[PDB]
Coordinates of C-alpha atoms and ligand atoms in Angstrom, one line a residue:
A1 CA -66.7 -38.7 13.7
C2 CA -64.0 -36.2 12.7
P3 CA -60.5 -37.8 13.1
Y4 CA -58.1 -37.2 16.1
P5 CA -55.4 -35.8 16.7
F6 CA -56.6 -32.6 15.1
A7 CA -53.1 -31.3 14.5
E8 CA -49.6 -32.5 15.5
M9 CA -49.1 -29.9 18.4
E10 CA -45.8 -28.4 17.2
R11 CA -44.4 -26.1 19.9
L12 CA -46.6 -25.8 23.1
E13 CA -50.0 -24.6 21.8
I14 CA -53.5 -26.2 21.5
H15 CA -55.8 -26.6 18.5
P16 CA -58.8 -24.2 18.8
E17 CA -61.4 -27.0 18.5
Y18 CA -61.3 -28.3 22.1
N19 CA -62.4 -24.8 23.4
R20 CA -64.9 -24.6 20.5
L21 CA -66.7 -27.7 21.9
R22 CA -66.4 -26.7 25.5
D23 CA -68.3 -23.5 24.7
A24 CA -70.6 -25.3 22.2
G25 CA -71.5 -27.4 25.3
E26 CA -70.7 -30.2 22.7
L27 CA -69.2 -33.7 23.6
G28 CA -66.8 -34.5 20.7
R29 CA -66.8 -37.8 18.8
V30 CA -63.4 -38.5 17.2
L31 CA -61.8 -41.3 15.2
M32 CA -58.5 -42.3 16.9
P33 CA -55.7 -43.9 14.8
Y34 CA -55.9 -47.4 16.5
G35 CA -59.1 -48.9 18.0
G36 CA -62.2 -47.1 16.9
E37 CA -64.1 -43.9 17.6
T38 CA -64.1 -42.4 21.1
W39 CA -66.1 -39.6 22.8
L40 CA -64.0 -36.5 24.0
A41 CA -64.7 -34.3 27.1
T42 CA -63.3 -30.7 27.2
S43 CA -65.4 -28.9 29.9
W44 CA -64.2 -28.7 33.6
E45 CA -67.6 -30.2 34.7
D46 CA -67.4 -33.2 32.2
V47 CA -63.6 -33.8 32.8
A48 CA -64.3 -33.7 36.6
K49 CA -66.9 -36.5 36.1
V50 CA -64.6 -38.8 34.2
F51 CA -61.8 -38.4 36.8
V52 CA -64.0 -39.1 39.9
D53 CA -67.4 -40.7 38.8
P54 CA -67.3 -44.5 39.3
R55 CA -69.4 -45.0 36.1
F56 CA -66.0 -44.8 34.2
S57 CA -63.5 -47.7 34.5
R58 CA -59.7 -47.5 33.8
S59 CA -59.5 -51.4 34.4
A60 CA -61.7 -52.1 31.4
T61 CA -59.0 -51.4 28.7
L62 CA -56.2 -53.5 30.0
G63 CA -55.6 -56.0 27.2
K64 CA -58.1 -54.5 24.7
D65 CA -58.2 -52.9 21.2
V66 CA -59.5 -49.6 22.7
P67 CA -59.8 -46.2 20.9
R68 CA -56.0 -45.4 21.3
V69 CA -53.2 -43.2 19.7
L70 CA -50.1 -45.4 19.9
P71 CA -50.5 -48.9 18.3
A72 CA -49.1 -50.9 21.3
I73 CA -51.8 -52.2 23.7
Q74 CA -51.7 -51.6 27.6
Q75 CA -50.0 -54.6 31.4
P76 CA -51.6 -53.7 34.8
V77 CA -50.5 -50.3 36.2
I78 CA -52.1 -48.6 39.3
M79 CA -53.5 -45.8 37.0
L80 CA -55.4 -48.6 35.1
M81 CA -57.1 -49.9 38.3
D82 CA -60.6 -49.3 39.7
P83 CA -61.8 -49.7 43.4
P84 CA -61.4 -51.6 45.5
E85 CA -58.0 -53.1 44.3
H86 CA -56.8 -49.6 43.4
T87 CA -58.2 -48.3 46.8
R88 CA -56.5 -51.0 48.9
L89 CA -53.3 -50.4 47.0
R90 CA -53.5 -46.5 47.2
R91 CA -54.7 -46.6 50.9
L92 CA -51.4 -48.4 51.8
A93 CA -48.9 -46.4 49.6
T94 CA -50.5 -43.1 51.0
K95 CA -49.3 -44.3 54.6
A96 CA -45.7 -44.2 53.4
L97 CA -45.8 -41.6 50.6
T98 CA -46.8 -38.7 52.8
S99 CA -47.3 -34.9 52.1
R100 CA -45.1 -34.5 55.2
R101 CA -42.5 -36.9 53.9
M102 CA -42.4 -34.8 50.7
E103 CA -42.2 -31.4 52.4
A104 CA -39.4 -33.1 54.5
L105 CA -37.4 -33.2 51.2
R106 CA -37.5 -29.4 50.6
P107 CA -34.1 -28.7 52.4
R108 CA -32.4 -31.5 50.3
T109 CA -34.0 -30.1 47.0
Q110 CA -32.6 -26.6 48.0
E111 CA -29.1 -28.2 48.3
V112 CA -29.3 -30.2 44.9
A113 CA -31.2 -27.2 43.3
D114 CA -28.8 -24.5 44.6
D115 CA -25.7 -26.7 43.8
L116 CA -27.1 -27.6 40.4
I117 CA -27.1 -23.9 39.7
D118 CA -23.6 -23.5 41.2
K119 CA -22.3 -26.1 38.6
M120 CA -24.3 -24.9 35.6
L121 CA -23.3 -21.2 35.8
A122 CA -19.9 -22.3 37.1
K123 CA -19.3 -23.8 33.6
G124 CA -19.7 -22.1 30.1
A125 CA -21.3 -19.0 28.7
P126 CA -24.7 -20.2 27.4
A127 CA -26.3 -23.2 29.0
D128 CA -29.0 -25.9 28.4
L129 CA -31.3 -25.7 31.4
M130 CA -32.7 -29.0 30.2
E131 CA -29.5 -31.1 30.5
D132 CA -27.9 -28.8 33.1
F133 CA -30.9 -28.5 35.5
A134 CA -34.4 -29.5 34.4
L135 CA -33.7 -33.2 33.9
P136 CA -31.2 -34.0 36.7
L137 CA -33.2 -32.3 39.6
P138 CA -36.2 -34.8 39.5
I139 CA -34.2 -38.1 39.2
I140 CA -31.9 -36.9 42.0
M141 CA -35.0 -36.1 44.1
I142 CA -36.6 -39.4 43.1
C143 CA -33.5 -41.3 44.2
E144 CA -33.2 -39.3 47.5
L145 CA -37.0 -40.0 48.2
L146 CA -36.3 -43.8 47.6
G147 CA -33.2 -43.6 49.8
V148 CA -30.9 -45.0 47.0
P149 CA -27.2 -44.8 48.1
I150 CA -25.6 -41.6 46.6
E151 CA -22.8 -43.9 45.4
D152 CA -25.2 -45.4 42.8
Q153 CA -27.2 -42.2 42.1
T154 CA -25.4 -42.0 38.7
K155 CA -25.2 -45.7 37.7
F156 CA -28.9 -45.7 38.7
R157 CA -29.7 -42.5 36.6
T158 CA -27.9 -44.1 33.6
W159 CA -30.3 -47.0 34.0
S160 CA -33.4 -44.8 34.1
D161 CA -32.3 -42.8 31.1
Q162 CA -32.2 -46.0 28.9
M163 CA -36.0 -46.5 29.6
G164 CA -35.5 -43.5 22.1
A165 CA -31.7 -43.1 21.9
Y166 CA -30.6 -46.6 23.1
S167 CA -30.6 -50.0 21.3
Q168 CA -33.5 -52.5 22.0
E169 CA -31.2 -55.1 23.8
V170 CA -30.1 -52.4 26.2
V171 CA -33.6 -50.9 26.9
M172 CA -34.9 -54.1 28.7
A173 CA -31.3 -54.8 30.0
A174 CA -31.6 -51.4 31.8
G175 CA -35.2 -52.0 33.1
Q176 CA -34.3 -55.5 34.4
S177 CA -31.2 -54.1 36.1
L178 CA -33.4 -51.4 37.7
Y179 CA -36.1 -54.0 38.7
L180 CA -33.5 -56.4 40.2
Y181 CA -31.6 -53.6 42.0
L182 CA -34.9 -52.1 43.4
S183 CA -36.1 -55.3 44.9
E184 CA -32.6 -56.0 46.5
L185 CA -33.0 -52.4 47.9
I186 CA -36.4 -53.3 49.4
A187 CA -34.9 -56.6 50.6
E188 CA -32.2 -54.4 52.4
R189 CA -34.8 -52.3 54.1
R190 CA -37.1 -55.1 55.5
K191 CA -34.3 -55.7 58.1
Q192 CA -34.3 -51.9 58.6
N193 CA -38.6 -46.7 58.4
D194 CA -38.3 -44.2 55.4
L195 CA -40.3 -44.4 52.1
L196 CA -39.2 -48.0 51.0
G197 CA -39.1 -49.2 54.7
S198 CA -42.6 -47.5 55.3
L199 CA -43.9 -49.2 52.1
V200 CA -43.0 -52.7 53.6
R201 CA -45.0 -51.3 56.6
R202 CA -49.8 -55.9 53.1
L203 CA -48.3 -54.9 49.8
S204 CA -46.9 -58.0 47.8
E205 CA -43.1 -57.8 46.8
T206 CA -44.6 -57.6 43.2
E207 CA -46.6 -54.4 44.0
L208 CA -43.7 -53.0 46.2
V209 CA -41.1 -53.0 43.3
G210 CA -44.0 -52.2 40.9
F211 CA -44.7 -48.9 42.7
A212 CA -40.9 -47.9 42.9
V213 CA -40.6 -48.3 39.1
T214 CA -43.9 -46.4 38.6
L215 CA -42.9 -43.2 40.6
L216 CA -39.7 -43.2 38.5
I217 CA -41.9 -43.2 35.3
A218 CA -44.9 -41.2 36.6
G219 CA -42.7 -38.2 37.8
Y220 CA -39.3 -38.1 36.1
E221 CA -39.7 -37.1 32.4
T222 CA -43.0 -35.3 33.4
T223 CA -41.3 -33.2 36.2
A224 CA -38.4 -32.4 33.8
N225 CA -40.9 -31.0 31.3
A226 CA -42.8 -29.0 33.9
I227 CA -39.5 -27.3 35.1
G228 CA -38.4 -26.9 31.4
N229 CA -41.8 -25.7 30.0
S230 CA -42.5 -23.4 32.9
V231 CA -39.1 -21.5 32.6
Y232 CA -40.0 -21.2 28.9
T233 CA -43.5 -19.8 29.5
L234 CA -42.2 -17.4 32.3
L235 CA -39.4 -16.0 30.0
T236 CA -41.9 -15.3 27.2
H237 CA -44.1 -13.3 29.7
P238 CA -41.7 -11.2 31.8
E239 CA -44.6 -9.0 33.3
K240 CA -45.0 -12.2 35.3
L241 CA -41.3 -13.1 35.8
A242 CA -40.8 -9.5 37.2
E243 CA -43.9 -10.1 39.4
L244 CA -42.0 -13.0 40.9
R245 CA -38.6 -11.3 41.4
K246 CA -40.2 -8.5 43.4
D247 CA -41.9 -11.0 45.8
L248 CA -41.2 -14.8 46.0
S249 CA -44.0 -15.4 48.5
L250 CA -46.1 -15.8 45.3
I251 CA -44.3 -18.9 43.9
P252 CA -46.5 -21.5 45.6
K253 CA -49.7 -20.1 43.8
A254 CA -47.5 -19.4 40.7
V255 CA -46.3 -23.0 40.4
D256 CA -50.1 -24.0 40.5
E257 CA -51.0 -21.2 37.9
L258 CA -48.2 -22.5 35.6
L259 CA -49.6 -26.1 36.1
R260 CA -53.1 -24.9 35.0
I261 CA -51.9 -23.1 31.9
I262 CA -49.2 -25.4 30.3
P263 CA -50.6 -28.5 28.5
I264 CA -49.2 -31.7 30.2
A265 CA -49.7 -34.0 27.1
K266 CA -49.5 -33.3 23.2
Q267 CA -53.1 -34.7 22.9
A268 CA -56.1 -36.2 24.9
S269 CA -55.6 -38.8 27.7
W270 CA -55.8 -42.6 27.4
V271 CA -59.5 -43.3 27.1
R272 CA -61.7 -44.3 30.1
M273 CA -64.6 -46.7 29.7
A274 CA -68.3 -46.1 30.6
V275 CA -69.4 -49.1 32.7
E276 CA -73.0 -47.6 32.9
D277 CA -75.0 -45.1 30.9
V278 CA -73.7 -41.5 31.7
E279 CA -74.7 -38.0 30.6
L280 CA -71.8 -35.7 29.6
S281 CA -72.7 -32.4 27.9
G282 CA -76.2 -33.5 27.1
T283 CA -75.1 -36.8 25.4
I284 CA -75.7 -40.4 26.8
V285 CA -72.3 -42.1 26.5
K286 CA -73.8 -45.6 26.7
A287 CA -72.2 -48.4 28.6
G288 CA -69.1 -49.7 26.7
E289 CA -68.5 -46.4 24.7
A290 CA -65.0 -44.8 25.4
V291 CA -64.3 -41.2 26.6
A292 CA -60.9 -39.3 26.4
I293 CA -60.3 -36.0 28.3
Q294 CA -58.5 -32.7 27.7
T295 CA -57.2 -31.2 31.0
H296 CA -56.3 -27.9 29.1
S297 CA -59.9 -27.0 28.0
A298 CA -61.1 -27.9 31.6
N299 CA -58.1 -25.7 33.0
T300 CA -59.4 -22.6 31.0
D301 CA -63.2 -23.1 31.2
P302 CA -64.9 -19.7 31.6
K303 CA -67.8 -21.4 33.4
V304 CA -65.3 -22.2 36.3
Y305 CA -62.4 -19.7 35.9
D306 CA -62.4 -15.9 35.5
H307 CA -60.0 -14.6 32.8
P308 CA -59.0 -18.2 32.0
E309 CA -56.7 -17.4 29.0
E310 CA -54.7 -15.0 31.2
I311 CA -52.1 -15.8 34.0
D312 CA -52.7 -14.4 37.5
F313 CA -50.8 -15.4 40.7
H314 CA -53.7 -14.1 43.0
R315 CA -56.5 -16.6 41.9
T316 CA -58.7 -17.2 45.1
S317 CA -58.8 -21.0 44.3
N318 CA -57.2 -23.0 41.5
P319 CA -59.1 -26.3 40.8
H320 CA -57.0 -27.2 37.7
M321 CA -56.8 -30.9 36.4
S322 CA -53.0 -30.7 35.4
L323 CA -52.3 -33.0 38.4
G324 CA -55.4 -35.2 38.2
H325 CA -58.8 -35.2 40.2
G326 CA -60.4 -37.5 42.9
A327 CA -59.4 -41.1 43.4
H328 CA -56.4 -41.3 41.1
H329 CA -55.0 -37.7 41.8
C330 CA -51.2 -37.3 41.5
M331 CA -49.6 -38.8 44.7
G332 CA -46.4 -36.8 43.9
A333 CA -48.6 -33.5 43.9
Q334 CA -46.8 -32.3 47.1
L335 CA -43.2 -33.3 45.8
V336 CA -43.9 -31.7 42.4
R337 CA -44.9 -28.4 44.1
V338 CA -41.8 -28.7 46.4
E339 CA -39.5 -29.5 43.4
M340 CA -41.0 -26.8 41.2
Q341 CA -41.3 -24.2 44.0
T342 CA -37.6 -24.5 45.0
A343 CA -36.6 -25.1 41.4
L344 CA -38.0 -21.8 40.0
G345 CA -37.5 -20.0 43.3
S346 CA -33.7 -20.2 43.5
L347 CA -33.4 -20.2 39.7
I348 CA -35.1 -16.7 39.7
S349 CA -33.6 -15.5 43.1
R350 CA -30.0 -16.7 42.3
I351 CA -30.0 -15.4 38.6
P352 CA -32.6 -12.5 38.3
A353 CA -30.9 -11.4 34.9
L354 CA -31.8 -14.8 33.2
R355 CA -32.8 -14.7 29.5
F356 CA -32.9 -16.7 26.2
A357 CA -29.7 -17.0 24.2
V358 CA -31.8 -17.2 21.0
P359 CA -35.0 -15.7 19.5
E360 CA -37.8 -17.6 21.2
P361 CA -39.6 -18.5 17.9
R362 CA -36.3 -20.4 17.0
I363 CA -36.5 -22.6 20.2
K364 CA -37.3 -26.1 18.9
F365 CA -39.4 -28.9 20.5
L366 CA -39.5 -32.7 19.9
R367 CA -41.7 -34.7 17.4
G368 CA -41.3 -38.2 19.0
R369 CA -43.3 -38.0 22.3
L370 CA -46.9 -37.7 23.8
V371 CA -45.8 -34.8 26.2
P372 CA -44.6 -31.4 25.0
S373 CA -40.9 -31.2 25.7
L374 CA -38.2 -28.7 24.6
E375 CA -35.4 -30.3 22.5
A376 CA -33.2 -27.8 24.3
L377 CA -33.7 -24.6 26.3
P378 CA -30.5 -22.5 25.9
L379 CA -30.3 -19.4 28.2
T380 CA -27.9 -16.6 29.3
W381 CA -27.3 -14.4 32.4
Ligands
HEM1 C1 -44.2 -32.9 37.8 C2 -45.4 -32.9 37.1 C3 -46.3 -34.0 37.3 C4 -47.6 -33.9 36.7 C5 -48.0 -32.8 35.8 C6 -48.3 -35.1 37.1 C7 -49.6 -35.2 36.7 C8 -50.3 -36.3 37.1 C9 -51.6 -36.6 36.6 C10 -52.3 -35.6 35.7 C11 -52.0 -37.7 37.1 C12 -53.4 -38.3 36.8 C13 -53.5 -39.7 37.0 C14 -54.8 -39.9 36.3 O1 -55.9 -39.6 37.0 O2 -54.8 -40.4 35.2 C15 -51.0 -38.2 37.9 C16 -51.0 -39.4 38.6 C17 -50.0 -39.9 39.3 N1 -48.8 -39.3 39.5 FE1 -48.2 -37.6 38.8 N2 -47.6 -35.8 37.9 C18 -46.4 -35.3 38.1 C19 -45.3 -35.8 38.9 C20 -45.3 -37.0 39.6 C21 -44.3 -37.4 40.5 C22 -43.0 -36.6 40.8 C23 -44.7 -38.6 41.0 C24 -44.1 -39.5 42.0 C25 -43.0 -39.2 42.7 C26 -46.0 -38.9 40.4 C27 -46.7 -40.0 40.7 C28 -48.0 -40.1 40.3 C29 -48.8 -41.3 40.6 C30 -48.3 -42.5 41.4 C31 -50.0 -41.2 40.0 C32 -51.1 -42.2 40.1 C33 -51.9 -42.1 41.3 C34 -53.0 -43.1 41.2 O3 -53.4 -43.7 40.2 O4 -53.7 -43.3 42.3 N3 -46.3 -37.9 39.6 N4 -49.9 -37.3 37.9

């Protein structure tokens, strides 16, 4: 078993191998740094199975020395649950966290988006979209979706930023301040029905605050990167920026085509566990063996997509895996699209003379994460 990761993904590209195996119709076996060897799925068909098939448990690695990447062991989160606990827990949260409820935020997003622009270009010459726009937009929208008082939208932020750049005694101090402030908020909503109110309706207080902290994590630093990384990719392919400044009616299907093509992690997912013998790619991953997935190789499979390694805003359908598949599919999906749609949309519309302030090859990324994130994205206009 050839060791994994294959190469520290510097910048935003992928190691050839993944696509090599997809096409080989080969299921990879790799040696992860911690825990042991794992299997590795790269095909759309075989990444679809691991997302949706019930022969693969996410439960079965809580408290375990499982084929992993970071030494720390994972601490029961929703994304580490199987049916029917997961299903009862998702079934409830879906009744509060609605696709409607999320479309309902588009007018606010416009405000914070279009006034985040106002400020940014109202300041200096060159800017840093990351600190001036890509990072603030999603926390502000997270807050607004929780119905956090705008008088604490900053104090709050400051707490979510110190989850690193902050001392150990003031990491947990932040978390505990966020946990105790987020229960009190749910306490001051039980007497009244928005998202936190709707959540109180069968969920335990423990699961209620749990979820509120999860959404913060699941969709803050991820949504930042999507906005950041997309702008980047769009500026290094203007044939396709231009295609969006001519008509903005495209941006929905664009957001999804940018989601397909940009890698969401620097490497393969947390591993799932086979709870019964399964065939993937002609191999019998036996019960107990572990399988990690690559969404990118699935998101550019020629057996599923035409001209995969090419952008195209007219794709009939777009069954990408950047936002998950089946039971555990991203329950921000709608908010994400909303955020990203209005984020890029105005951004483009407002400032159609946008460009890098530096030679792209010179635009640096970070070494100390699992998701690809720009260290800074300086621009001009
Ligand atoms: C902006 C880019 C985002 C991307 C690319 C993204 C991607 C994903 C992916 C790939 C999963 C797969 C879970 C899995 O099957 O392992 C997922 C799950 C999830 N995401 Fe997101 N997400 C984003 C933003 C958000 C936001 C903004 C929220 C909440 C406000 C959110 C909440 C969740 C939740 C709760 C799950 C777990 C659902 C479950 O386990 O049933 N995400 N997301």
